[model samples]
Target: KQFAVIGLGRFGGSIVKELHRMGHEVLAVDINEEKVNAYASYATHAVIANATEENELLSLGIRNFEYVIVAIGANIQASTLTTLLLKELDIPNIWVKAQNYYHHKVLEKIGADRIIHPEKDMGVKIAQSLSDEN
Candidate 1:
């Protein structure tokens, strides 16, 4: 039960914390040290890798991508840049976090495999939970 997570934000942190509790080996990755330090307890290993740099992700299993996700830090450019980077590095199935409509459009042009719009979709789901569904 070894899982490699590429970001230690809420999205990435969620996996290691939960999966580790279930007794799986989790690798917590992140650019920020605080969350890496924080989630280190719940994860088996913690490391930092800048997604925008080429060889940074190389040693971290470049041969087999094993499903990587850029939970994308708090910034927009960071996400888009990493998305573009992955498209060049042998093309793995990547999940993107698009902070805006423009981001969605740009990422598609850059060939992001699966992209997500954060705020709006959650709002729609909130509405559904309120009344639309049931």
Candidate 2:
């Protein structure tokens, strides 16, 4: 699948790396110059742009991507805003990493196709593995 990952944080970076390793085409995007440069070798393309801005995303041809993953961790506002813009662009599939319950709620209201709770899911797995009961 053609993927576009916005935000090159730990979560986003991992996604791009793994997808590329699996031989999928991925576009890695971040506002930070260092992060984009770091990921350029792994991702199909690495772009430095403010994802919250509609024009930047448009120029990147975000709408053409099969899935746009919004994983902006440090800024909830930027994450939500980016998702909103993607929805406005009528992107078919959007997956977002939510920082918290409220953020998930907001993303849901704005019509994010999928809201991933990565930390929470990992926490549950760790807890279950630690428990005595099988």
Candidate 3:
């Protein structure tokens, strides 16, 4: 499946790398060129672009991807704008990372198909894995 990951923060970066390792077509995008360069080897495409702008996403033909994952955090505004643009682009399935419950609500209102809390989910998964292993 073709997956596009926006943002290059720790959470986003990790997801992009793991997806690539799993043999998926992963597109890693970020405004920071350095971060994109860092993930260069992992993702099929690493791009530096401002996702808040709909034109940027359209230029990449975001609708073509099977699933579009918005991993932008830190700035709620940018994340919201990007998600809105994705909605405008009519991407079939969009998953956005929400920092908190309020953010999750906002994302849902803006038309994100799903919302994910990476930090919370990671903690749960780690605990589950440790318990299972023991």
Candidate 4:
């Protein structure tokens, strides 16, 4: 499957690397030139562009991807808008990394295919691990 990941922060970066290692064609999109350049070696292709801008996404041919992951960090405005653009583009599978509980609701309202709560999920994992008798 072809995957396109927008944003190159901790969450997005990990996804790109894992997907590539799984032998999937991955396109890493980031607004940061350094991060984009850094992942070029790991990804099938790396592009630097503003995901919030619909035209920029169109220029990247975002509609072609089987899955598009929105992982913009901190900048809720950017993340939300990028997800909205993906919704409008009608991309088959849209996954979003929600920054918070409210952000999760927003993504759900915007019709995201999958919403990832990395921090919360990790916290839950650690809690469960600590409870283990082993």
Candidate 5:
């Protein structure tokens, strides 16, 4: 499946890399040129842009992609607004990264098709890893 991943923080980077590894086309977006360059080799296409603007996303053929994942971390405004833009673009599936319950609620209210909490999910994974080892 074709996927669009916005933001190239650790969470976003990891998702793009893994999705590419899994044989899917991933278009990675970020405001930082360095981050975009870092993932250029892994992603099908990596572009530098401020995803807060929906037109930037639309230019990437957002509607044509099967799913768009908003992975912005530390920028709740960008994350929320990006998801709203994706929704407005009529992208079939929109996944958003939420830093907290409140963020998730906001994303949901904006028509996010799904939400992921990487920090919390990873924390749980780490706990499970330790528990299983003991």
Candidate 6:
């Protein structure tokens, strides 16, 4: 399946790398040139793009991808706007990483297909591990 990941933060970057390693066609996009370039060798296509802009995303053929992941961190507004545009564009599958509960709630209200809280999930996992060790 074709996948497009917008936002090349640690979470987004890891997803793109793993997906590409698994032989999937992945398009990696980021607002930062350095982040985009970092994934050039791993992704099918790596480009600096502003996903918050509907036109920019459409120009990248984002709607054609089987799945599009919005992983904008430290910018809830950008993440929300990007997800909203993707939804409006009728992208088949839209996944987003939420910065917190509030962000997750907004994503849910906007109809994000999948909402993830990596940091929260990781924290839970770590707590579980420590408890198990005790």
**Candidate topping TM-score:** 2
CA lDDT for candidate 5: 0.86
Candidate 1 is scored at a TM of: 0.75
Best by lDDT: 2
- Candidate 5 residue 88 C-alpha distance from true site, Å: 0.9
Superposition TM-score, candidate 2 onto the true structure: 0.91
lDDT minimum window of 10 residues, candidate 1: 59-68
- Which runs of model 5 end up more than 4 angstroms from their true locations? 123-134
**TM-score of every candidate relative to the true structure:** 0.75, 0.91, 0.89, 0.90, 0.87, 0.90
For residues 1-134, write the lDDT of model 5, one tens digit per residue: 67889888888899999998988888998998999999999998999988887677667777888888888888899888888877888888988889779998888788888888876888899999999997
Which regions of candidate 3 fall more than 4 Å away from where they truly are? 130-134
Model 1 ranges with Cα > 4 A deviation: 1-4, 15-26, 131-133
Candidate 2 Cα RMSD after full superposition onto the native fold (Å) = 2.1
- lDDT at 51 for candidate 5? 85
Any residue pairs clashing in model 2, and if so which? none
lDDT of 1 by residue, 2-97 (tens): 355666766667766888888877666788788788987887777777777778767565435545566765678878887777667755577676
Q: Model-by-model lDDT, in order?
A: 0.72, 0.92, 0.87, 0.90, 0.86, 0.90
Candidate 2: lDDT of 39? 96
Q: Give the candidate order by descending lDDT.
A: 2, 6, 4, 3, 5, 1
Error of 4 at 102 (Å): 1.6
* Candidate 6: C-alpha lDDT: 0.90
Which portions of model 4 show Cα errors greater than 4 Å?
Answer: 126-134
Candidate 6 versus the native: TM-score? Answer: 0.90
Worst 10 residues of 3 by lDDT: 54-63
